[PDB]
Design a protein around this ligand. Sequence first.
Ligand code: HEM
Ligand code: HEM
Lengths: 360, 360
Amino acid sequence: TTGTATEPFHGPHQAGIATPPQAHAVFLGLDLRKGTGRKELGRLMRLLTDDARRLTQGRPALADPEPDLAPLPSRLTFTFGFGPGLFKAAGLEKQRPEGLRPLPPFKVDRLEDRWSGGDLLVQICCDDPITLAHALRMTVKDARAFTRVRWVQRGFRRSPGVQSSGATQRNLMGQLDGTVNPVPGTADFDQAVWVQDGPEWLRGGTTLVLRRIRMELEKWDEADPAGKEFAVGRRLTSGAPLTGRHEHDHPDFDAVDSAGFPVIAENAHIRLAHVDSPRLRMLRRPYNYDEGLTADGRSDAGLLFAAYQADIDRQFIPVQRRLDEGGDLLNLWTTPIGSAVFAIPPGCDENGWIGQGLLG
Amino acid sequence: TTGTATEPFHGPHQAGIATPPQAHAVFLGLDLRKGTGRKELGRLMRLLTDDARRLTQGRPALADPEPDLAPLPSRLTFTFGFGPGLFKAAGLEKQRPEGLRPLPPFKVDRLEDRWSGGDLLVQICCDDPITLAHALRMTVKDARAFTRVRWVQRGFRRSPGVQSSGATQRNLMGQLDGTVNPVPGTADFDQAVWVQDGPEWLRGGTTLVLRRIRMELEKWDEADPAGKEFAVGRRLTSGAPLTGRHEHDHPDFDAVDSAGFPVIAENAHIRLAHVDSPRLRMLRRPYNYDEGLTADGRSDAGLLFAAYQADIDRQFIPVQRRLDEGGDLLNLWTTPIGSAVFAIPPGCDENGWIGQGLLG
Ligand code: HEM
Ligand code: HEM
C-alpha cells in the first residue's frame, strides 16, 4: 500500500514544485481581509507552516478538527505563494519582484474575476482525495480569520499506480501533456526554476503563473483528427512530433513536406511555445478539471495550467505572447478564463516558517 | 496494474454493486425528453450497453471522440437504473415495482429539486478520474439525443492502493463508514440485495436509494469528541462499538454505563439503524463529496449515500423512519438535500443489453 508515503516538508525549497505531480490538487486563492497587515500575515504563516509540517507527515494539526484523517498522508504537499496584494498589505513593496504583477492582456483572454488574482495561494497536492479534503479544511480553519476565499480550483491527474512514475499522462483532449519539461535533479532545472537574482528573500523560491483554461470539447469533438494533430504538432496516439516516430524524438522545426510547406505548422502549438535554450524553459505542472453538465449535455472541463519559472518576464510572457501573436491553432479550442501570479518563497527547516525571510 | 485491471461487464448481475467500491464515482441522473418512448429507450440502452461493453475492457466506444482515453480502464463499471417516471414513458406501468417510488417525506429532509428524482440513472465507477471523465463524456454523447441531464453527482473514496482491499475507509467526518454490511459472495448478500419477487424482468436486479446528505462540518467542529462518538455509538479511531474493543465486535445493545443508561444511546445512529435479520440489511456503498467554499470558508461537503436492497419498503424505509422518528443524534450534523430512487435491472451477456427483459 501507498498511503504511508510522504514527501519532505522541510528543505531549501518548498515541496510541490519539483515533486513529481500527485494525482490530486487544490489551488486555494485567498484575499486578505482589511485588517490583515504584516503582523497578521506572520501569525497566519506560522499557523499554516505548522499545519503543513504535521499533516504532510501524517500527524494531526494543532486543533485538528478530524485527527483520524491525518494518518496516511499519501505524499501530501503544501506550496505557499504570495500575490502582488500581499506585498501591499505587508508594507513590503520594495521586496516585490518587478515581474510579479498581473499578466498583460492577450487577445485570446476571456478572463473572469472569480478565477483570477488572489493575495495568498495555498497549493495542496496529494495522491489521495480524502487526505486532500482534510488538508484543505484545516487550511481554511486557520486562514478564515485573516482571509476570504477568492477561488478554489480543484484538479486531477491519473490515480496513483495507473501509470508508471515519469510516464507522460494525457489531458481531457486525449493529448499526451508534459513531454517537454525541465527535469528535477539536473543543473538546467535549477537554472530554469529556482530564483537566483532579484530580492534576496526569494532566492531558492520560484514564481507561478496559474491559468484556468477552458477546453471547448464540443467543438473539439467536431474537429478532424488530422487537424487536431496539425494544431499541436504531434500525433495523438504516439505523442511523436509530426517529423518523428517516438514521443521523445526532438521536433524538427526546419522540416518541410514534399510541396515545401513546414511539416510542423507555422502556427502549431509546439512551434510557437518552443524555446531553444533549456535554461529558459518553464516547468509545466498542470492538472485537469471536469465540473458539471448543462441540461443539453455540454461539459465544463479544461486545464489548470500551472507554470513555474525563475522569471515571469523572461520565461512565461515571451511564450504566451508568441502563442497569442502567432495565432496558435490550439486557440480554436482553448480559452483562458482565469489568471493569477504568485511568488513562491524558499523552504524552511524546523524552528522556521514559510515566508519568514520576507515577513519576519 | 491498477490501470489495466478490469471488471467483467457481463454476468447475471450488473457490475458496480457487488463490485468492491472503486476510488471514484459519478451518478448521472437523466430525464427523458418528450419524444423518448419505449422504442427510443431500447435504442438508447443498446447504445449505452455497447459503449460500456467496450469501455470497461479498455476499448474505444463506437464513434469515440477521444479513443486514446479508453485504454487503462482501471476497473471501470457502469450500472444503469430506471426511475419511476421511465415506466409511464415506455407504456410499461404495470411492470413498475410497487416499491419503486420516491421516498416519503422525513422531518430531517431539506430536499432540493436539483439533487432529486430522475428517470434514468447511469452510475459510473472507476479507480481513475481521467478514465471516468471520458466514460461520462461518452455516456452523455450517446444519451443527449434522448434525455436531458437532471444532475451529476461526483464522489470519491480513497485512491487505489492507499489501504488494503476490504479495509473499512473513513468519511469526511473522520468516521469509519461501512463496517456492518452484507459481504459480496455470501448468501446473506444475495437475499438482501438481489430481487427475487415482483415483476420478472427485475429478478437478479436490485433497487438503489441515492441520497445526497450534507455534513454540517462547522457544527461538527464545535462538538467534543465524546459527544461525536456518543452520537454514532462507536469510537472514532478504532471504529469499535462503545461496548467493545475492535471494529467488527458486535455492539452490545443491552449494556449500561455506571449511571444505568445505555452505553449505546437510545438515539445513537447505529442503534436506530440496526436490523437484526442479516437478510433484511441494506448494502451501503457510499461516496464522499467535497465541492467549493464560501468566501468565509464554509465547506459544501457530505456523503453520496447509496443504498442497494431488494425491497425499499422492507429494507430501507423502516430504517430511515426509525432514524427520523427516533431522533438520531447524528441528525444534528447531517441534512438530506437530495433523494432519488431507481430500479436496477439484472445483468446481460454478450448477446443482450441492459433492460432487454423490460424494454425488448
Ligand atoms: C488547455 C490549454 C493547453 C493545452 C491542451 C496544451 C497542450 C500541449 C501539448 C499536447 C503539448 C505537446 C506535448 C508536450 O510537450 O507537453 C504542449 C507543449 C507545450 N506547451 Fe501547451 N497546452 C496548453 C496551453 C499552454 C499554454 C497557455 C502555454 C503557455 C506558455 C503552453 C506552453 C507549452 C510549452 C512550452 C510546450 C513545450 C513545447 C516544446 O518546446 O516542444 N501550453 N502543450
Ligand atoms: C448522512 C450521513 C451518515 C453518516 C456520516 C453515517 C455514518 C455511519 C457510521 C459512522 C456508521 C457506523 C459504522 C458502520 O457500520 O458503517 C453507520 C452505520 C450504519 N448506517 Fe449510517 N450514516 C449516515 C447516514 C445514514 C442513513 C441516511 C442511513 C439510512 C438507512 C444509514 C444507515 C446505516 C446502517 C444500516 C448502519 C449499520 C448499523 C448497524 O447495524 O450496526 N446511515 N453510519
